[PDB]
């Protein structure tokens, strides 16, 4: 099981993105929009004591994978998928696409690494809808037994909608 440092504090990234225009001529699989957000960690750490303990990168809205697979997940907007990941500032240390699990080394102290959180909005069908992406927590990153206290969350806010405009 995993222990968190005293004063452990989740970092949340509001995902604010301007209007994404989808055109009929955009082929299926097009990355319509790719946004990077700075991951700015604090001194929070986690230490675990069992080799079965895990770090989990999860998508709590629990939408199904889209028709095109490849970790492109459906949204409330037909034909519009999202894909999430993290990377170092120098673009290395690719986290892998959400969701994933990774085994943790017992007695290693883990921190949140700095870098970019990457959100891609991707066309997944010939016909695409219009509207705001549903608001809420789009990703979470937490250790075993500490799902209530993640290292990192990303959130779409009601007050800052991500609008899909299809023409």
Residue numbers in the entry: 1 to 167
What do the authors report?
We identified two virulence pili independently critical to A. baumannii catheter-associated urinary tract infections, the chaperone-usher pathway pili Abp1 and Abp2. Further, their respective tip-adhesive proteins, the adhesins Abp1D and Abp2D, make use of large, distally oriented binding pockets to adhere to glycoproteins like fibrinogen, a wound-healing protein important in CAUTI pathogenesis. We demonstrate that Abp1D and Abp2D RBDs are structurally similar, and each binds fibrinogen and other relevant host glycoproteins important in CAUTI and other infections. These proteins share a common binding mechanism, using a large, distally oriented, and flexible pocket that recognizes a complex glycan receptor.
When determining the Abp1DRBD structure, we solved two molecules of this protein in the crystal (asymmetric) unit. The structures of the two molecules of Abp1DRBD had a backbone rmsd value of 0.176 Å, demonstrating that they are highly similar. However, while most of the binding pocket was structurally conserved, one region of substantial variation was a 10 amino acid stretch (R86-S95) encompassing the anterior binding pocket loop. Compared to molecule A Abp1DRBD, molecule B’s anterior binding pocket loop was displaced up and into the pocket, moving the α-carbon of S91 by 7.9 Å in the >50 Å long structure. The anterior loop’s flexibility is significant because this loop can change the shape of the binding pocket, which likely affects protein function. While these two residues are conserved in the Abp1DRBD, they are too far away from each other (>4 Å) (in the crystal structures) to form a salt bridge in both Abp1DRBD molecule A or Abp1DRBD molecule B and the loops are more closed than in the Abp2DRBD structure (especially in molecule B of the Abp1DRBD structure). An R86E variant of Abp1DRBD similarly abolished binding to BSM as measured by enzyme-linked immunosorbent assay (ELISA).
